[PDB]
């Protein structure tokens, strides 16, 4: 051994294990999925009720970076909201210097170069978080990006991060996200995260949904209660 | 101080006088004002004579560094861009008025650089104290695409207008002709003014000066 | 980052420190320099090492370095580390002359350099210098002086010392043939060619294999003279004439 | 900048880089000092001369002011930079408070310089021990010593260096009140002390006394040749 | 062959080698990718493949071809996180050439500045030396087209035909038999001889959805990326 | 970020700096190169073989000029060479801005070798893996110097660096004398590079640069073909 | 093999803070007793040699006119903490024109006690008692190398610490007088030290509400010893 | 002004194969002499001198900064300094204080060491070198020295007539100045020997 202690050393076959070890820490966080509809992006996070003593609305794994940009995280939660602070701060420097709202192909570029910068030195560790960025503009449409702890970003029609990643994105491609608007998506977002996480592992869990598009007039916010109650009404019909 | 430049049909002719006047007393009778920058680019200097020396050596050091790294010929727009970026940084405390001219791959190019950092490409420029006198010769008798015999006759005529009309100017006229293949730097192009001959013999002999103490020390 | 640190500053559990003793181990090999004085004048006898037949033989000296206008030094050890020290105390003497308008005394030039040399053995996590070197010179306070530096940072005044490869054999013979204040600058030269006759294993004493420089006090000059290769070999054979005389007659 | 903790604790409560530096003191040459009621007398032994060196550049007894002398052991390269930092401080005391430096003050400066230097980043501790000797104002002769950990400590008679336990055991069975009776009789205690050490039979010893109003006055090897005669002459007749 | 920490940081082996760099050359090979660049008589062509394993991924955001300046394009191999960081430097260094010197940077001077930066990573024993490669193309006045490669060791050279990636040695053996028979090269022949390089090494015989081609020519010096429709025009003409 | 600030080059218990001894192993595995001065100028000749026919040989150069009258070749590893070239290009300028004079060749080697010694003691760096040969004709007489990764330097009449350098130095010892012209030293520099090259020594497998009192310059492959012709 | 200086144990405490707790078990023992009449506070000296001057060493040292101190463990680095306490009591007098309370002196020192690291280098290996009379009467505090301080009533610190605390819990009560608290402490020190008890091996100091910090000397001290 | 605070005058003049330099001896504060032996010409190697005139602080300051940089040059290189090289060295030293300038005007005169050819130049207070072929002057009484030298200089002069010309040039001009005088020292150098003479001037 000895070839895997620092992030400054390659292996004798040419790969870095400190990044791969931090990628393994993501699959112990639960599940965060997000797909984009024809005219907007819908996030979705199932939230484990660890004990009864916590309060409904605690420790949200679903942030709010800018007025139109949303973030759903998966990983070590202290590093999640630390990456959320620099992304919230990066968009403020764009509007102050250039005058207008930051686009997603630039925002996820500036954040991923900040994540990549900790995969080079021995003085710092790689982050233990993977997360998704989605938004809607009236001149660019809906956007959906995703960033690993190594620093690689791509566009997606729908993605999934958490424990059951392949077992979640198997059913995403059963949908048709090219033509559905962001109303019937909300019922289909919830349904594919009820079929995952058998009740042997967890007793009870919490649904948390997010929502952006021109139906929300460009601003990012949470779903209302009645709409996610319709999805929770559309929960127990997967037993047939 | 009177410096001038022109662009003829093939290259660039630069001209200057040779006088440095400290106060109202002539300090130097043969001060060279046309400087080396590259084997294709020269510059004339005006204003503070110490500021123009230490500036024209800094840029010529960097272009020798730049061209030896790239392995090809320098360009005139590079020497323009290095000069006006550093003169703007010193906010005009460095008094340096320069006429920049050279023949790169793109052709002949003539610039004039002011000591706050403002530049301009022009077909003919004059700088210096007697520049207004030299402008009137250019303004009356310029024609585009002249031959180099007509150009050299024009510039020496314009520098002579700054000789016989300005107090702080006037000695042997320098010239330099830069073309695509020839560099003719030549300092005594003409002698318009001489010194008169002495008449009275003032000659002293050995022993006409009283000495208190003398010392002799040999060397080898 | 603390796994790669080699800790070139700490003590050893027996009390001493290992890093400068490895340097003074390397100061034994690779070079031979010696000095001598008893009267008006002082000399540096040094032996050249690279005697290959393809070299230009320039720069007026090989291991002799003029430091001040009235003192010089001979160096031993890593030659690349030597070039940094030699142009470091060269301007210690000049910043003295800027400050006082007087040439520097020969002793407190040595103490100034040996404090810079001591600091690397003491903090910074830094490789010390494997360089020991001699010092000749003149000043108005004590006249002709002779010093010796060590890589630990401690100096000392001497009368005749060698830092060669067989330096212990040279010192053992310098305190077998010596006289306090009577060795003029011809008997010392004959004694110098006698000592490096012994310590140089390459016999017959090639005149191009050694270098000798003398510092004599002329009234306002303090002439530092590197004597040329035309007067070495006549001093070589002069040692050779007397040894065949002394062996046969005994 | 090299930032690394050199001196750290042991798992049982020691500072190893400190007590390793105390063994570098424990093989330097022996320095002995006693105090008389009017004249202090301290003298190192083991000059270890090789008769081809300048005798003045090898000295280990220097002066910090006119009144304060200092001897040491350990390794010499660390010594003469602590001394030069003490010369600045005792000179800067005079630009302040007008009197010359009390001998207790200059020991607190050396000891506090030596402690915080076992505390900083990237620095091995000093490897010297000292004896600070002076007769201060109002003529009270006293001495001190300094451990490499930085504990200043006064004494009536002491000895450091190679072979310091045997000399310290020798002094307690020998230090009477009438041993410091005469200024020449206190010297006969020191010459009897270092002769009970590494040999140094008049040829490797250098005593240096101070008579509370002079500077240091080293006796040349003629009175030590005289004193070691008569110190052994009294030993010749009694036994 | 090893002594000390020469396996871990960038110091010398007893044989004179240094292993952290030659570990990093085979970090390029973990991408599973191969790119080909061919210089013509009056043009320069980069061809490379793209492998999109998902239907849920946006196929317009996986381009390894990048536009550095208006007249300079490049292709990136190796791992993605280090390659996109190195493009960000090359965009920055070209803009400072124009601001300091007033004209467009030559493509060999840009490759020198990248290789000088990459030299410093294998020169200090702290940083990890960026395991990804670099191939540039461009039109230079009084030089025509020219192609350059920069490796993570700090070495660079001008080529006439270039391969990089997993199948590097098999591609260069194909091209060196092609160039030494010394046929003249038009525009379309350099497009034909570059596609048939990685079509015979990889043995694919593909449809136009898996490769991407950038080009520069001295009639339009703008670096331009070919549409899939006009990729198909060269492809059906390749099958005579 | 920051650095390491500790030397990773220490003394062995046998008293040898081991990392410098390993850097000389990388120098000895480089391309062979010879340098000869003879009474009116210096000849620097190296050996440059591309690995395949795909490489453009007119793109990089082994022989580099430093100023009007100083050239410089190497035998070591590639990317370390271009660093201390750009360093030595700059050092010749700060001498010129002070003194208004082209730098002597001796004073350049005073300052280039001071960089290499400074770089083998400072914190967190491995030493260079190149050795140099520096030519030039200052004040009539020519000069030929060789540095090393340790930071020392020498004054050679003729020497060889690279692979089989111990065979070239025996070959030059039986060849070189005091009295040769520049065109004779060119002919014996090709004759000593033929000891270690492959079978084809064409006009582009080698690279030759000369000094005169007219200044340093580098030969084009036209007359290099004429020197390679009628050789050996 | 070599950890850093700033590493947690698997049991979670630290390494070098816990090692410095062991270092004060080598120091000389010291006893302080809080009494409503005033704070008495004693120590031994551990005289090594007959040639040694006895009064040059000290363990009791004063911080201000109404606050005394007592040190144990190492000594050379105790003088750094004493100097920071003396400056702190004078900055509080300069800016507020009053006397700093005994508790607020201790937390001004205890914030300094755990500040080592690798930026801006080891914890201090001393242990301190702070006896003083502020406006809440007589006080007695005890700090740690860990920087944890708590008010004590009869605290015994040194090599004989746990042996003395057991013999001190049996004789202390809340209604002592100062004349018997001084006598009760020297009974404990007579047991635990090596050499015999006299007027040179030990020294005391008491602080009163009426008068200021007073340190006993070798004339008024032995009347306690001969009347033990 | 500032240059008129202490006075001073330095003249250099070129001959056939020889060059001479001269300066006054007065040290004073605006009206009041202090001494008549103030050194203003300093030796910089054999056959190469420098003259300084201006503020009395910077005369002694530049002459010690320059000697600091000169000995480092002549030890790092094995040769003596050329007269043209020192002109670039002094001009570098003054231009570093572009905004904190030294109030002095140096005059450099000496022979080139290999080919014994004379060299003269002068510099302003911020380092503009001006080489001539006949004479350079510096100090307060500059204009009086131009009327001497333009009227008396001959092109090719032996060291006897070179001495008599520069003597009459100094004695007549400095007598017309008020803040300069009290004696004139003359150094005349040549390839074989060197000569220091002091003249019989007005102590008035």
UniProtKB/Swiss-Prot annotation, chain A:
Name of the encoding gene: PSMA3
Protein induction: Down-regulated by antioxidants BO-653 and probucol. Up-regulated by bacterial lipopolysaccharides (LPS) and TNF.
Residues bearing PTM Phosphoserine: 238
GO MF terms held by the record: ubiquitin protein ligase binding
Alphabetized InterPro entries for the sequence: Ntn_hydrolases_N (IPR029055), Proteasome_alpha (IPR050115), Proteasome_alpha-type (IPR023332), Proteasome_asu_N (IPR000426), Proteasome_sua/b (IPR001353)
Oligomer and partners: The 26S proteasome consists of a 20S proteasome core and two 19S regulatory subunits. The 20S proteasome core is a barrel-shaped complex made of 28 subunits that are arranged in four stacked rings. The two outer rings are each formed by seven alpha subunits, and the two inner rings are formed by seven beta subunits. The proteolytic activity is exerted by three beta-subunits PSMB5, PSMB6 and PSMB7. Interacts with AURKB. Interacts with CDKN1A. Interacts with MDM2 and RB1. Interacts with the C-terminus of TBXA2R isoform 2. Interacts with DNAJB2.
PANTHER family on file: PROTEASOME SUBUNIT ALPHA/BETA
Subcellular localization, as worded in the UniProt entry: Cytoplasm; Nucleus
Entry keyword annotation includes Phosphoprotein: yes
Lineage, broadest ranks: Eukaryota, Metazoa, Chordata, Craniata, Vertebrata
Keywords attached to this entry: Acetylation, Cytoplasm, Host-virus interaction, Nucleus, Phosphoprotein, Proteasome
GO cellular component, one term: proteasome core complex, alpha-subunit complex
Domain of life of the organism encoding this protein: Eukaryota
Family statement: Belongs to the peptidase T1A family.
Gene3D superfamilies in UniProt: Glutamine Phosphoribosylpyrophosphate, subunit 1, domain 1
Record's protein name: Proteasome subunit alpha type-3
Residues with the N6-acetyllysine modification: 52, 201, 225
Residues annotated as transmembrane: none
Chief location bin: cytoplasm
From Swiss-Prot, chain B:
GO molecular function terms listed in the Swiss-Prot or TrEMBL record: endopeptidase activity; threonine-type endopeptidase activity
Compartments where located: Cytoplasm; Nucleus
Secretion signal span: none
Record flagged with keyword Chloroplast: no
Reaction catalysis annotation: Cleavage of peptide bonds with very broad specificity
Keywords per UniProt: Cytoplasm, Host-virus interaction, Hydrolase, Nucleus, Protease, Proteasome, Threonine protease, Zymogen
EC number(s) recorded for this UniProt protein: 3.4.25.1
Enzyme class: hydrolase
GO biological process annotation, one example: proteasome-mediated ubiquitin-dependent protein catabolic process
Active site: 1 (nucleophile)
UniProt keyword Protease present: yes
GO (cellular component) term, any one: nucleus
Tissue-by-tissue expression: Expressed at a low level in colonic mucosa. Up-regulated in colorectal cancer tissues.
Subunit structure: The 26S proteasome consists of a 20S proteasome core and two 19S regulatory subunits. The 20S proteasome core is a barrel-shaped complex made of 28 subunits that are arranged in four stacked rings. The two outer rings are each formed by seven alpha subunits, and the two inner rings are formed by seven beta subunits. The proteolytic activity is exerted by three beta-subunits PSMB5, PSMB6 and PSMB7. (Microbial infection) Interacts with HIV-1 Tat protein.
Family: Belongs to the peptidase T1B family.
Name of the protein in its database record: Proteasome subunit beta type-7
Species whose genome carries this gene: Homo sapiens
Entire protein: shown range: 44 to 263 of 277
From Swiss-Prot, chain F:
Leader sequence residues: none
Disulfide bridge positions per record: none
Pfam family, one: Proteasome_A_N
Residues carrying Phosphotyrosine: 4, 22, 74, 119
Keywords: Acetylation, Cytoplasm, Nucleus, Phosphoprotein, Proteasome
GO biological process: proteasome-mediated ubiquitin-dependent protein catabolic process; response to virus
Entry GO CC: cytoplasm; cytosol; extracellular exosome; extracellular region; ficolin-1-rich granule lumen; nucleoplasm; nucleus; P-body
SMART domains linked: Proteasome_A_N
Cellular location(s): Cytoplasm; Nucleus
Positions bearing N6-acetyllysine: 68, 169
Known function: Component of the 20S core proteasome complex involved in the proteolytic degradation of most intracellular proteins. This complex plays numerous essential roles within the cell by associating with different regulatory particles. Associated with two 19S regulatory particles, forms the 26S proteasome and thus participates in the ATP-dependent degradation of ubiquitinated proteins.
PANTHER family listed in its UniProt record: PROTEASOME SUBUNIT ALPHA/BETA
Family in the record: Belongs to the peptidase T1A family.
Protein name from the UniProt record: Proteasome subunit alpha type-2
Organism listed in the record: Homo sapiens
UniProtKB/Swiss-Prot annotation, chain H:
Protein location: Cytoplasm; Nucleus
Residue list for modification N6-acetyllysine: 76
One Gene Ontology CC term in the entry: proteasome core complex
Gene Ontology BP annotations: proteasome-mediated ubiquitin-dependent protein catabolic process
CDD domains: proteasome_beta_type_3
Pfam family, one: Proteasome
Family per similarity comment: Belongs to the peptidase T1B family.
Task of the protein: Non-catalytic component of the 20S core proteasome complex involved in the proteolytic degradation of most intracellular proteins. This complex plays numerous essential roles within the cell by associating with different regulatory particles. Associated with two 19S regulatory particles, forms the 26S proteasome and thus participates in the ATP-dependent degradation of ubiquitinated proteins.
Subunit relationships: The 26S proteasome consists of a 20S proteasome core and two 19S regulatory subunits. The 20S proteasome core is a barrel-shaped complex made of 28 subunits that are arranged in four stacked rings. The two outer rings are each formed by seven alpha subunits, and the two inner rings are formed by seven beta subunits. The proteolytic activity is exerted by three beta-subunits PSMB5, PSMB6 and PSMB7. (Microbial infection) Interacts with HIV-1 TAT protein.
Name of the featured protein: Proteasome subunit beta type-3
Species for this entry: Homo sapiens (Human)
């Amino acid at each position: 051994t000895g070839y895997d202690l620092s992030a400054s050393t390659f292996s004798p076959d040419g790969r870095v294990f400190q990044v791969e070890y931090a990628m393994k820490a993501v699959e112990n966080s639960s599940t965060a999925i997000g797909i984009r509809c024809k005219d907007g992006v819908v996030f979705g996070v199932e939230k484990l009720v660890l004990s009864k003593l916590y309060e409904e609305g605690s420790n949200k794994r679903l942030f709010n970076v800018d007025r139109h940009v949303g973030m759903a995280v998966a990983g070590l939660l202290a590093d999640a909201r630390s990456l959320a602070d620099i992304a919230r701060e990066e968009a403020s420097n764009f509007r102050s210097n250039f005058g207008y709202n930051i686009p997603l192909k630039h925002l996820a570029d500036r954040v991923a170069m900040y994540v990549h910068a900790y995969t080079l030195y021995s003085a710092v560790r790689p982050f233990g978080c993977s997360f998704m960025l989605g938004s809607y503009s009236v001149n660019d449409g809906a956007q959906l990006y995703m960033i690993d702890p190594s620093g690689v970003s791509y566009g997606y029609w729908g993605c999934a991060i958490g424990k059951a990643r392949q077992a979640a994105k198997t059913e995403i491609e059963k949908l048709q996200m090219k033509e559905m608007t962001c109303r019937d998506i909300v019922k289909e977002v919830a349904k594919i995260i009820y079929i995952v996480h058998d009740e042997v592992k967890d007793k009870a869990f919490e649904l948390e949904l997010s929502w952006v598009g021109e139906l929300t007039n460009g601003r990012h916010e949470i779903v209302p209660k009645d709409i996610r109650e319709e999805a929770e009404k559309y929960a127990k019909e997967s037993l047939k | 101080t009177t410096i001038a430049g022109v662009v003829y049909k093939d290259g660039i002719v630069l001209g200057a006088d040779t006088r440095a006047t400290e106060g109202m007393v002539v300090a130097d009778k043969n001060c060279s004002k046309i400087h080396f920058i590259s084997p294709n680019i020269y510059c004339c200097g005006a204003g503070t004579a110490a500021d123009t020396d230490m500036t024209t050596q800094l840029i010529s050091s960097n272009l020798e560094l730049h061209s030896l790294s790239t392995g090809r010929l320098p360009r005139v727009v590079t020497a323009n861009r290095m000069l006006k970026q550093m003169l703007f940084r010193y906010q005009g405390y460095i008094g340096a008025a320069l006429v920049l001219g050279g023949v790169d791959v793109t052709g002949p190019h003539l610039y004039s650089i002011y000591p706050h950092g403002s530049t301009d490409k022009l077909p003919y420029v004059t700088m210096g104290s007697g520049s207004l006198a030299a402008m009137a010769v250019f303004e009356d008798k310029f024609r585009p695409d002249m031959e180099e015999e007509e150009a050299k006759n024009l510039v020496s005529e314009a520098i002579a207008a700054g000789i016989f009309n300005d107090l702080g100017s006037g000695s042997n006229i320098d010239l330099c002709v830069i073309s695509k293949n020839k560099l003719d730097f030549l300092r005594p192009y003409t002698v318009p003014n001489k010194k008169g001959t002495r008449l009275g013999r003032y000659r002293c002999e050995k022993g006409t000066t009283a000495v208190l103490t003398e010392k002799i020390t040999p060397l080898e | 980052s603390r796994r790669y640190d080699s800790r070139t500053t700490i003590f050893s559990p027996e009390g001493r420190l290992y890093q400068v003793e490895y340097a003074m181990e390397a100061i034994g090999h690779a070079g031979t320099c010696l000095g001598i004085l008893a009267n008006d004048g002082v000399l540096l006898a040094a032996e050249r090492r690279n005697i290959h037949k393809l070299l230009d033989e320039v720069f007026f000296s090989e291991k002799i370095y003029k430091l001040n206008e009235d003192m010089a030094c001979s160096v031993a050890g890593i030659t690349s580390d030597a070039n940094v020290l030699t142009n470091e105390l060269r301007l210690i003497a000049q910043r003295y002359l800027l400050q006082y308008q007087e040439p520097i005394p020969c002793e407190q030039l040595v103490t100034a350099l040996c404090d810079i040399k001591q600091a690397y053995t003491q903090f910074g996590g830094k490789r010390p210098f494997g360089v020991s070197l001699l010092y000749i010179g003149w000043d108005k306070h004590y006249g002709f002086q002779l010093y010796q530096s060590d890589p630990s940072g401690n100096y000392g005044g001497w009368k005749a010392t060698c830092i060669g490869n067989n330096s212990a054999a040279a010192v053992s013979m310098l305190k077998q043939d010596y006289k306090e204040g009577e060795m003029t600058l011809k008997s010392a030269l004959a004694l110098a060619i006698k000592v490096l006759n012994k310590t140089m294993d390459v016999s017959k004493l090639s005149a191009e294999k050694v270098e000798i420089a003398t510092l004599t006090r002329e009234n306002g000059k303090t002439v530092i003279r590197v004597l040329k290769q035309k007067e070495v070999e006549q001093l070589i054979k002069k040692h050779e004439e007397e040894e065949a005389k002394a062996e046969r007659e005994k | 900048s090299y930032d690394r903790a050199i001196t750290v604790f042991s798992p049982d409560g020691h500072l190893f880089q400190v007590e390793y530096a105390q063994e570098a003191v424990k093989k330097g040459s022996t320095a002995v000092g006693v105090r008389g009621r009017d004249i202090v007398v301290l003298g190192v032994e083991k000059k270890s001369v090789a008769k081809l060196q300048d005798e003045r550049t090898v000295r280990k007894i220097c002066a910090l002011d006119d009144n304060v002398c200092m001897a040491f052991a350990g390794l010499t390269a660390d010594a003469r930079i602590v001394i030069n930092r003490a010369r600045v401080e005792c000179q800067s005391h005079r630009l302040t408070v007008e009197d010359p430096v009390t001998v207790e003050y200059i020991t607190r400066y050396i000891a506090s310089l030596k402690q915080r230097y076992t505390q900083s980043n990237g620095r091995r501790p000093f490897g010297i021990s000292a004896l600070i000797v002076g007769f201060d104002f109002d003529g009270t002769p006293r001495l001190y010593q300094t451990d490499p950990s930085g504990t200043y400590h006064a004494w009536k008679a002491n000895a450091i260096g190679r072979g310091a336990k045997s000399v310290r055991e020798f002094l307690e069975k020998n230090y009477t009140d009438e041993a410091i009776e005469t200024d020449d009789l206190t010297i006969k205690l020191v010459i009897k002390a270092l002769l009970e050490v590494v040999q140094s039979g008049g040829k490797n010893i250098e005593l240096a006394v101070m008579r509370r109003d002079q500077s240091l006055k080293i006796l040349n090897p003629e009175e030590i040749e005289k004193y070691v005669a008569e110190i052994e002459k009294e030993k010749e007749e009694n036994e | 062959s090893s002594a000390g920490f020469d396996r871990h940081i960038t110091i010398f082996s007893p044989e004179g080698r240094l292993y952290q760099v030659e570990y990093a050359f085979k970090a390029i090979n973990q991408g599973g990718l191969t790119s080909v660049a061919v210089r013509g008589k009056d043009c320069a062509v980069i061809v490379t493949q793209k492998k999109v394993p998902d239907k849920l991924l946006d196929s317009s955001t996986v381009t390894h071809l990048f536009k550095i300046t208006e007249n300079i394009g490049c292709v990136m191999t190796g791992m993605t996180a280090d390659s996109r960081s190195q493009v960000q430097r090359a965009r920055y260094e070209a803009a400072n050439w124009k601001y300091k010197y007033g004209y467009e940077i030559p493509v060999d001077m840009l490759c020198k500045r990248i290789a000088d930066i990459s030299q410093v990573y294998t020169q200090n024993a702290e940083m990890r030396p960026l395991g990804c490669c670099m191939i540039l193309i461009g039109i230079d006045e009084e030089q025509g087209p020219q192609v350059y490669k920069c490796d993570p060791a700090g070495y660079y050279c001008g080529f006439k035909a270039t391969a990089a990636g997993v199948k590097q040695t098999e591609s260069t053996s194909f091209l060196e038999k092609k160039v030494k028979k010394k046929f003249d090269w038009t525009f379309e022949q350099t497009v034909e001889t570059a596609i048939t390089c990685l079509s015979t090494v990889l043995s694919i015989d593909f449809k136009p959805s898996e490769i991407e081609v950038g080009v520069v020519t001295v009639e339009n010096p703008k670096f331009r990326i070919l549409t899939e429709a006009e990729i198909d025009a060269h492809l059906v003409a390749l099958a005579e | 970020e920051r650095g390491y600030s500790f030397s990773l080059t220490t003394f062995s218990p046998s008293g040898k700096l081991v990392q410098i001894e390993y850097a000389l192993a990388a120098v000895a595995g480089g391309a062979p190169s010879v340098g000869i001065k003879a009474a009116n100028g210096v000849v620097l000749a190296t050996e440059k073989k591309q690995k395949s026919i795909l490489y453009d040989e007119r793109s990089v150069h082994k022989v580099e000029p430093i100023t009007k009258h100083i050239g410089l070749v190497y035998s070591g590893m590639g990317p370390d060479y271009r660093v201390l070239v750009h360093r030595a290009r700059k050092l010749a300028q700060q001498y010129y801005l002070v003194y208004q004079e082209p730098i002597p060749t001796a004073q350049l080697v005073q300052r280039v070798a001071s960089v290499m010694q400074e770089y083998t003691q400072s914190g967190g760096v491995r030493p260079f893996g190149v050795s140099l040969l520096i030519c030039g004709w200052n004040e009539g007489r020519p000069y030929l110097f060789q540095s090393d990764p340790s930071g020392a330097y020498f004054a050679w009449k003729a020497t060889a660096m690279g692979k089989n350098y111990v065979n070239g130095k025996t070959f030059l010892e039986k060849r070189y004398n005091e009295d040769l012209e520049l065109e004779d030293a060119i002919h014996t520099a090709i004759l000593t590079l033929k000891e270690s090259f492959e079978g084809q020594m064409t006009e582009d497998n080698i690279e030759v640069g000369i000094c005169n009192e007219a200044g340093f310059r580098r030969l084009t492959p036209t007359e290099v073909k004429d020197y390679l012709a009628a050789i050996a | 093999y070599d950890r850093g200086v700033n590493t947690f144990s698997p049991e979670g405490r630290l390494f070098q803070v816990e090692y410095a707790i062991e270092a004060i078990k080598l120091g000389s023992t010291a006893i302080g007793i809080q009494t409503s009449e005033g704070v008495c506070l004693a120590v031994e000296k551990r005289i090594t040699s007959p040639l040694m001057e006895p009064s040059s060493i000290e363990k009791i040292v004063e911080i201000d006119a109404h606050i005394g101190c007592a040190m144990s463990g190492l000594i050379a680095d105790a003088k750094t903490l004493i100097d920071k306490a003396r400056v702190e009591t004078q900055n509080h007098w300069f800016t507020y024109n009053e006397t700093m309370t005994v508790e607020s002196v201790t937390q001004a020192v205890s914030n300094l006690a755990l500040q080592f690291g690798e930026e801006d280098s080891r914890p201090f290996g001393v242990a301190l008692l702070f006896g003083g009379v502020d406006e809440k009467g007589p006080q007695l505090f005890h700090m740690d190398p860990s920087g944890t301080f708590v008010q004590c009533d009869a605290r015994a610190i040194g090599s004989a610490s746990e042996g003395a605390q057991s013999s001190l819990q049996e004789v202390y009560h809340k209604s002592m007088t100062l004349k018997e608290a001084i006598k009760s402490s020297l009974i404990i020190l007579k047991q635990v030290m090596e050499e015999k008890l006299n007027a040179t091996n030990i020294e005391l100091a008491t602080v009163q509400p009426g008068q200021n910090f007073h340190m006993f000397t070798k004339e008024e001290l032995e009347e306690v010893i001969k009347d033990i | 002004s500032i240059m008129s605070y202490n006075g001073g005058a330095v003249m250099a003049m070129k001959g056939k194969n020889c060059v001479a330099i001269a300066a006054d001896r007065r040290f004073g504060i605006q009206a009041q002499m202090v001494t008549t032996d103030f050194q203003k010409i300093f030796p910089m190697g054999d056959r190469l001198y420098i003259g300084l005139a201006g503020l009395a602080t910077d005369v002694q300051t530049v002459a010690q900064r320059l000697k600091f940089r000169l000995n480092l040059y002549e030890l790092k290189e094995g040769r003596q300094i050329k007269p043209y090289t020192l002109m670039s060295m002094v001009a570098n030293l003054l231009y570093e204080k572009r905004f904190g300038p030294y109030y002095t005007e140096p005059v450099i005169a000496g022979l080139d060491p290999k080919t014994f050819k004379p060299f003269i130049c002068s510099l302003d207070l911020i380092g503009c070198p001006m080489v001539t072929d006949d004479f350079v002057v510096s100090g307060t009484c500059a204009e009086q020295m131009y009327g001497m030298c333009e009227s008396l200089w001959e092109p090719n002069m032996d060291p006897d007539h070179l001495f008599e010309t520069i003597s009459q040039a100094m004695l007549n001009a400095v007598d017309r100045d008020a803040v300069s005088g009290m004696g004139v020292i003359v150094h005349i150098i040549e390839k074989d020997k060197i000569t220091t003479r002091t003249l019989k001037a007005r102590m008035d």
